Each structure stands twice: as structure tokens, then as C-alpha cells.
Amino acid sequence: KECDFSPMLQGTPPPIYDFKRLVFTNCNYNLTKLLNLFQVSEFSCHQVSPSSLATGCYSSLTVDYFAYPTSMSSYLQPGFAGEIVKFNYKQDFSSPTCRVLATVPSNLTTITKPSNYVHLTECYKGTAYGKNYLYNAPGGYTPCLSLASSGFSSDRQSHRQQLSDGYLVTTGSVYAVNGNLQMAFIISVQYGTDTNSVCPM
Amino acid sequence: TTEDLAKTFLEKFNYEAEELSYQNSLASWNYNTNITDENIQKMNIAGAKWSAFYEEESQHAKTYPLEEIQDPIIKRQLRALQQSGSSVLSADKRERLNTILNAMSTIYSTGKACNPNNPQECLLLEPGLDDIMENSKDYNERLWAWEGWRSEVGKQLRPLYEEYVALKNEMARANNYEDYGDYWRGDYEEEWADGYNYSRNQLIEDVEHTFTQIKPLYEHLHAYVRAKLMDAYPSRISPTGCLPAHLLGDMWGRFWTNLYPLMVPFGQKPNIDVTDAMVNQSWDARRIFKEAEKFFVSVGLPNMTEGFWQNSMLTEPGDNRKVVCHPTAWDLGKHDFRIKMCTKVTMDDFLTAHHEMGHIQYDMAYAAQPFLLRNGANEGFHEAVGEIMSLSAATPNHLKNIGLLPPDFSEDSETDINFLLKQALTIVGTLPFTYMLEKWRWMVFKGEIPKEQWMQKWWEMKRDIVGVVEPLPHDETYCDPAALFHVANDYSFIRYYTRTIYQFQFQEALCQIAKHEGPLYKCDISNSREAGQKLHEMLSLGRSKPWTFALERVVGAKTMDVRPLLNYFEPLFTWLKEQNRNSFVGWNTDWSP
Numbered sequence: 001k002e003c004d005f006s007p008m009l010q011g012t013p014p015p016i017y018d019f020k021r022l023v024f025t026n027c028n029y030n031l032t033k034l035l036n037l038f039q040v041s042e043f044s045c046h047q048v049s050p051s052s053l054a055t056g057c058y059s060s061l062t063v064d065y066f067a068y069p070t071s072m073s074s075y076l077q078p079g080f081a082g083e084i085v086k087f088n089y090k091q092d093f094s095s096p097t098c099r100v101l102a103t104v105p106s107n108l109t110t111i112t113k114p115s116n117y118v119h120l121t122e123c124y125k126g127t128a129y130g131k132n133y134l135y136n137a138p139g140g141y142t143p144c145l146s147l148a149s150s151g152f153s154s155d156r157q158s159h160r161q162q163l164s165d166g167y168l169v170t171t172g173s174v175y176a177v178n179g180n181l182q183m184a185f186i187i188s189v190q191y192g193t194d195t196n197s198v199c200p201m
Numbered sequence: 202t203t204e205d206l207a208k209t210f211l212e213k214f215n216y217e218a219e220e221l222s223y224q225n226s227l228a229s230w231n232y233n234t235n236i237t238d239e240n241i242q243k244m245n246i247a248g249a250k251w252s253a254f255y256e257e258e259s260q261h262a263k264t265y266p267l268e269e270i271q272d273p274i275i276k277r278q279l280r281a282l283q284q285s286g287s288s289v290l291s292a293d294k295r296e297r298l299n300t301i302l303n304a305m306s307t308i309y310s311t312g313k314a315c316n317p318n319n320p321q322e323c324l325l326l327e328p329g330l331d332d333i334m335e336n337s338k339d340y341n342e343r344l345w346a347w348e349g350w351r352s353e354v355g356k357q358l359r360p361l362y363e364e365y366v367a368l369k370n371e372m373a374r375a376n377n378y379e380d381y382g383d384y385w386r387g388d389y390e391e392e393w394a395d396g397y398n399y400s401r402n403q404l405i406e407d408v409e410h411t412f413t414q415i416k417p418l419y420e421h422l423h424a425y426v427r428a429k430l431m432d433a434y435p436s437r438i439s440p441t442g443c444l445p446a447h448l449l450g451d452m453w454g455r456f457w458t459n460l461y462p463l464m465v466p467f468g469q470k471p472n473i474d475v476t477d478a479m480v481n482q483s484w485d486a487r488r489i490f491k492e493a494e495k496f497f498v499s500v501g502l503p504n505m506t507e508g509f510w511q512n513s514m515l516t517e518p519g520d521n522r523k524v525v526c527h528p529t530a531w532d533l534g535k536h537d538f539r540i541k542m543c544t545k546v547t548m549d550d551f552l553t554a555h556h557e558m559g560h561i562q563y564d565m566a567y568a569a570q571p572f573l574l575r576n577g578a579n580e581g582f583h584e585a586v587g588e589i590m591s592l593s594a595a596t597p598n599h600l601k602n603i604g605l606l607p608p609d610f611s612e613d614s615e616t617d618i619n620f621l622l623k624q625a626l627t628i629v630g631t632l633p634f635t636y637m638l639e640k641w642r643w644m645v646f647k648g649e650i651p652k653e654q655w656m657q658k659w660w661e662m663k664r665d666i667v668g669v670v671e672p673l674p675h676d677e678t679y680c681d682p683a684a685l686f687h688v689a690n691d692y693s694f695i696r697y698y699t700r701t702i703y704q705f706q707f708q709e710a711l712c713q714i715a716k717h718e719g720p721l722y723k724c725d726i727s728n729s730r731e732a733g734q735k736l737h738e739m740l741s742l743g744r745s746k747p748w749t750f751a752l753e754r755v756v757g758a759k760t761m762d763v764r765p766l767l768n769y770f771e772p773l774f775t776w777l778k779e780q781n782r783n784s785f786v787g788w789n790t791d792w793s794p
């Protein structure tokens with residue numbers, strides 16, 4: 001059974017803070033064809049090699065895909081503590097991982113280009129004593145997902161939700177898409193327990 | 202308990218102010234980046250709403266009296282709101298004061314002085330008169346440029362300045378203040394602390410006590426400057442008298458930096474300049490800021506944010522866009538930090554990058570504080586923090602490490618004196634002037650100097666304190682102080698004094714932590730994370746603790762101290778004493794003008 005890669009090929013790709021996670025188990029994967037479906041720009045793997053990513057069978061294959069420009073790749077680098085890591089996505093390095101950048105050619109009309117790129121700059125709990133910043137857990141989601149779900153229209157737009165003892169604020173920055181759409185994948189392979197059935201085609 | 206009714210009010214106000222000040226800051230940034238006709242109108246529209254909201258909230262904040270709130274943070278936030286200024290007079294007095302201020306500002310900004318010999322030489326202060334007063338060696342040209350500015354603009358400002366003093370004194374006395382000088386000195390007041398209190402009357406004592414210790418070094422510097430200015434204007438300066446006011450290097454003699462070419466100590470050793478080395482290595486305007494960020498990271502401070510690189514304007518736009526060339530660091534609001542600069546490949550811009558990025562690093566530190574407490578400890582801290590970075594960045598060791606100097610470079614002991622003397626012409630050459638000016642204003646606001654002794658007391662003080670004599674007699678129809686930008690634009694001037702005292706108080710304190718051996722002027726705090734943690738601990742406080750406490754967090758003392766400033770200029774003091782053996786140190790007040 002070929003692994004279903006249709007969801008990333010259909011519809012508008014999600015933003016980084018609302019990344020789409022798909023878990024593949026017990027299927028045959030051909031990541032080379034998917035890479036050929038895009039214009040690959042960057043490929044950096046930690047605790048694993050790209051040759052050892054195409055080959056080798058894994059218990060589980062988790063793909064966290066989102067829309068991401070190439071210019072902000074350096075901000076996703078491990079160790080750098082910035083807005084992306086603090087409030088959008090912290091890559092989990094407990095297991096071997098791969099960060100893959102790509103570029104969708106204009107001929108691929110099955111994917112709709114969003115108006116802009118959106119990432120969270122602030123997500124904090126506000127009392128009267130100041131600000132208490134909430135930081136993302138490694139691999140988890142942001143606490144401001146429900147509030148940010150409404151979306152952002154302009155640059156640095158803020159959403160506020162009242163709490164029992166203060167409020168919760170989230171902020172979004174907006175930059176428009178110019179050129180062929182670029183999108184990023186975080187691929188994590190699990191060796192732990194359940195059958196190395198995620199095998200190459 | 203009314204403290205909990207204050208907490209909810211502060212919670213609402215914090216969010217409303219955060220959402221309303223950001224739009225005003227963004228409008229100002231848009232206007233300053235693209236100067237058009239729509240942008241200025243939007244800037245004014247956005248600035249009116251913020252002012253109206255702030256006035257409404259300040260009026261509402263008086264509902265909670267301060268004598269029953271026990272939380273120091275809540276009381277500190279409430280005091281800033283309840284402090285009311287010009288919104289206490291009548292409507293007629295308020296609009297009269299606004300009109301007087303606008304008229305003074307537009308008279309200063311649109312004033313012309315014309316050559317007494319050439320009737321077609323009416324020059325503005327900014328492009329032409331400044332050029333004459335900073336790039337000339339002719340006694341008569343400088344004299345006419347000085348007198349024309351003092352007589353064409355400073356003569357029609359006195360009637361306005363006389364009503365301004367009364368109108369501001371009325372406003373100050375309508376707010377439980379002795380005078381407008383007490384209102385201005387109130388920026389250094391700290392109350393309700395255990396031992397970290399500071400009275401408004403203590404600022405005068407501290408300023409005078411520091412000036413008393415500063416005086417000898419300034420006397421030696423003034424003696425050297427006078428002895429070297431004789432050779433440029435023969436038979437014009439007395440060997441024992443003051444210095445004429447029109448030969449000091451600018452319109453007002455605020456800085457003596459423009460006199461350096463006339464008094465270079467050692468003319469055979471050229472000062473360190475790395476513009477050619479930066480050109481040879483193909484340094485664009487982005488690598489300068491990358492290296493500044495690297496230097497800031499090397500001491501344990503955070504990186505620059507993602508939006509800093511996307512939204513800042515580090516280069517002049519080429520598509521006919523009109524911009525303001527002044528370099529500034531902008532705290533736009535919701536964790537948005539920007540820098541506006543027209544970067545050129547030069548050493549001066551290399552230092553300006555560090556100076557303006559120190560401000561941004563300061564703004565990153567207190568971003569997790571309430572809206573009202575998101576400032577420096579006082580008005581002198583925010584500029585003193587940005588100067589130690591520039592002090593560390595220009596050291597020969599740093600320039601060798603970054604790669605702008607050959608690895609075999611050997612530090613001469615004669616270029617050190619040149620650097621120190623050029624440093625002690627903007628720093629030590631402005632401390633008297635600044636102080637003198639403020640003193641005059643304070644007395645003028647206190648009523649000690651009657652309206653019929655303003656010019657007499659002004660020139661008597663400038664002869665006694667600064668050591669500078671007038672070129673021509675000036676009766677009581679001019680307003681000489683009003684000819685300076687800050688006096689005509691109603692700006693406090695003491696922040697330039699304390700700034701120069703904190704600046705060397707921090708640098709020394711961070712240089713003992715960094716384990717530096719040798720003179721203080723050669724100290725570099727790079728590659729020292731321990732010295733960065735100590736600075737960040739004070740930076741993160743913001744305006745949430747009394748500035749005495751914040752100062753003690755770094756330097757270990759609560760009071761302003763001038764000993765580090767004298768320790769910085771010790772080799773130059775020794776050299777000046779050595780060179781002044783065959784001359785007279787000191788001046789004579791009422792002698793040859």
C-alpha cells in the first residue's frame with residue numbers, strides 16, 4: 001500500500017503555527033517522487049542521512065508540513081531562540097529528524113496559494129503585573145491555537161481572550177507571497193516498537 | 202479593597218494602550234520612511250487618538266488615591282497615570298501656551314541671518330550658518346555669523362520667552378510644585394522605598410558635588426585649548442582671560458570636537474581609521490549590523506528578532522523615496538524593534554550601528570513589563586547604555602579580532618593620547634556648558650534672577666563657570682539662551698549631564714567583572730558572558746524599581762559618582778599637566794573680553 005500523500009497536494013497548505021501532521025504506518029513510501037513534484041531547495045538532516053532517509057524501514061513516519069519561505073530557513077536552525085521556535089514550532093531532536101525545503105512549480109494547480117505567510121510573534125498571558133510569555137514545548141503545539149484559529153488580516157494583528165484572572169493575547173505577523181510557493185516538511189522517523197512496516201517502494 | 206479595583210483598571214488600560222500606541226508608532230515610522238502628503242495626515246490622525254485616550258485614562262486614574270495601595274508595582278503604575286501636566290490651566294491659558302510654544306519653535310526653525318557686507322547672504326541656521334560656524338578659521342566671518350544669529354532670531358524670542366516662563370510657572374504651581382524647575386527635577390524623584398529614596402532637592406546637591414570634582418580637569422583642558430588657539434588667532438586672545446564665544450567650534454560651543462585639527466597632540470601619528478580596510482574587504486551595509494549583532498551575542502545577550510531583519514531600513518532607498526537621515530532605534534510596540542539608518546561604509550557608521558543596537562537590546566530586556574513601566578530607569582539610563590557599547594566597539598583589540606586590523610598591529614602610546622584628547626572634547630568640554638545652562642534656567646524659573654537681569658546673569662555665569670566671554674556687549678534686548686534648540690523647544694537639559702556620569706560608572710563596573718588588566722580606556726567587554734549577565738539583570742528591570750536600586754544592581758552604589766569618569770581620563774590628565782607647566786591654568790572673569 002502506497003502511503004497517502006494527497007493531503008499535502010490538495011488545498012491550501014497550513015501555516016507554521018497550525019502545521020499539519022500526518023502519521024504513516026504500514027505503507028510503502030516513495031519520497032523521491034514527492035520531492036520531484038517540487039523544486040527542492042534545502043535538505044538538512046540531524047541524526048540521520050538523506051540516503052538513510054530514502055532507504056530504511058521505520059516503525060512510524062511523521063510528516064509535519066506547513067508553508068514556509070526559504071528566506072526564514074536560518075531561523076528554524078537548531079539552537080537559535082527566536083519567534084519561530086518560541087511561538088510557532090520547536091523541532092524535536094530526541095529522535096533523528098529531517099528539515100526539507102521545496103518549491104511548488106506554477107504548473108501544480110492542485111495546490112492553492114494562500115494570500116500571505118503568517119507566523120506568531122507573541123503568545124502570552126497578561127495580568128496587571130506585566131507579561132508572562134508562553135513557550136512552545138518541543139514537538140507540541142502553541143497554547144494560542146484556539147485564539148489564533150480566527151486568522152490574521154494585517155501585520156501584527158492581536159487577538160485577546162479574557163480569563164478568570166487576566167487575559168491571553170496572541171499576535172500575528174503577515175508577509176505576502178511573491179513568486180512560486182515554498183513549503184517545508186519536518187520528517188521524523190520512529191524506531192521504537194511497532195513493526196518497521198513503513199518501507200520504501 | 203480598592204487595590205483590586207485598581208488591578209482591573211490597569212489590566213484594561215494595558216491592553217488598550219498597547220493596541221493604541223502601536224498604531225501611532227507605525228504611522229510615525231511610515232511618515233519618516235516615506236515622506237508624502239497622505240503619510241503626515243495619517244500620522245497626525247493616529248497621534249490625536251492616542252493623546253485623547255491617554256488624557257481620558259489619566260483623568261480616570263485619579264479615582265484611586267495612592268495612600269492606600271500597598272503593592273509597589275501597582276502604585277508605580279498608578280503614579281505615572283495620575284501625574285498631570287499642562288491639563289490643569291484654563292482653556293485660554295492652555296491655548297495661549299500652545300501658541301507661544303509653536304511660535305517659538307517656528308521662529309527657531311525658520312530664522313535667517315544675513316551678511317552685514319553682502320545683502321544677498323541670508324542663510325538658515327541648519328545648512329549655511331552651521332557650515333560657517335563649524336568649518337571656518339576667519340575671525341570676522343565667525344563673528345558676523347555668531348552675531349547675526351544672536352540678533353535676528355534671539356532678539357524676537359525674548360518677548361515670547363518672558364510669557365512662556367510665567368505661563369509654565371503657573372502650570373507648575375497649579376500642581377503642588379515650587380516652580381517649573383522643580384517639575385523638571387521631579388524626573389529623578391523616588392518615593393516609598395526603604396533606603397532607595399531620592400528627593401528633588403538632592404539632584405542639585407549631587408550635580409554640584411560632581412561638578413566640583415570635575416572642575417580641575419576642565420581647567421587644564423581649557424588652559425591647553427586657549428594656549429593652542431592663540432597660534433590660530435594672533436593678538437586676539439588674552440594669555441590669562443576667557444575664550445571668545447564665537448571661536449569654539451560651533452554656534453554655542455556645546456562641544457569642542459571641531460577644534461581638534463588645530464590642537465592635535467602628535468601630528469605624525471594618524472588616528473586609527475578602518476574605512477579603507479572595510480572597503481578592501483567588500484563590506485556592505487548588512488555585514489556591519491551582522492558584526493554588531495555578533496558582538497552583542499558574544500557577551501551573552503540575545504540575537505536580533507526575525508522582524509528586525511525584514512522591517513528595518515539599513516540602507517537609503519533608491520526609488521526617489523524621501524527619508525529622514527537621522528539614525529534612530531524604534532520600539533514600535535508589540536515586540537517590534539526596528540532601526541532607521543542610512544548606512545555608509547565608514548568607521549563612524551560602524552560605531553553608530555553598535556550605538557543604535559544597544560538601544561534595541563535595552564528595549565528587548567524590559568518587554569515583559571507593564572505598559573507604563575516599559576522605559577529606562579530614568580532619562581539618563583537609556584542613552585548611557587548605548588554609549589558603553591560604542592566605547593567597547595572602537596578598541597584596537599576588538600578591531601583586530603573582527604578582522605579590520607592586521608594581526609601584527611602594535612598599539613602606540615602616542616595615538617592613545619590623540620584618541621583621549623579627541624574624546625575629552627565632546628565629553629569633558631560639554632559638562633560645564635550643560636550644567637551652566639541648566640543652572641540659569643532653574644534660577645530663571647525660581648525667581649532668583651529677575652526679568653531685568655537675564656542677560657547680565659547669563660554672561661556673568663558663562664564667564665565664571667564655563668570660562669567663555671562674549672565678543673560684543675549684549676544689553677537686555679536679546680535672549681541668548683533661547684538661541685539653542687532645546688531652550689526654544691522646551692526640553693530638559695540635565696539628561697545630558699547624568700548620562701555622562703552613568704556612562705563611565707557602568708563601563709568601569711562591567712570591566713572589573715570582565716577581569717581587565719590595565720587602563721580603563723583600553724577595556725573591552727567582548728567575549729565575557731559574565732559581564733553581560735550583570736548588565737541584563739539591570740536592563741530587564743525597566744522602570745519598575747527606583748533608579749537607585751537599578752544602579753546598585755550593577756555598580757554597587759546608589760549615588761551618582763564621578764570618580765570613574767576621572768579614572769578614564771587619567772593618562773590625558775597627566776599629559777595635560779605636563780604640557781601646561783609653562784602656561785597659566787585658570788581664567789579671569791571680568792578681564793579682557
Ligand SMILES: *[C@@H]1O[C@H](CO)[C@@H](O)[C@H](O)[C@H]1NC(C)=O
Pocket residue numbers: 079080081498502503504
Ligand atoms: C544567535 O544566532 C546565531 C546564528 O547566526 C546562533 O549561532 C546563536 O546560537 C544564536 N544565539 C542566541 C543566544 O540565540
Ligand SMILES: *[C@@H]1O[C@H](CO)[C@@H](O)[C@H](O)[C@H]1NC(C)=O
Pocket residue numbers: 235237238239240522
Ligand atoms: C511610500 O512608500 C511605500 C513603499 O515604499 C508605499 O507603499 C506607499 O504607498 C508610499 N506612500 C504613498 C503615499 O504612496
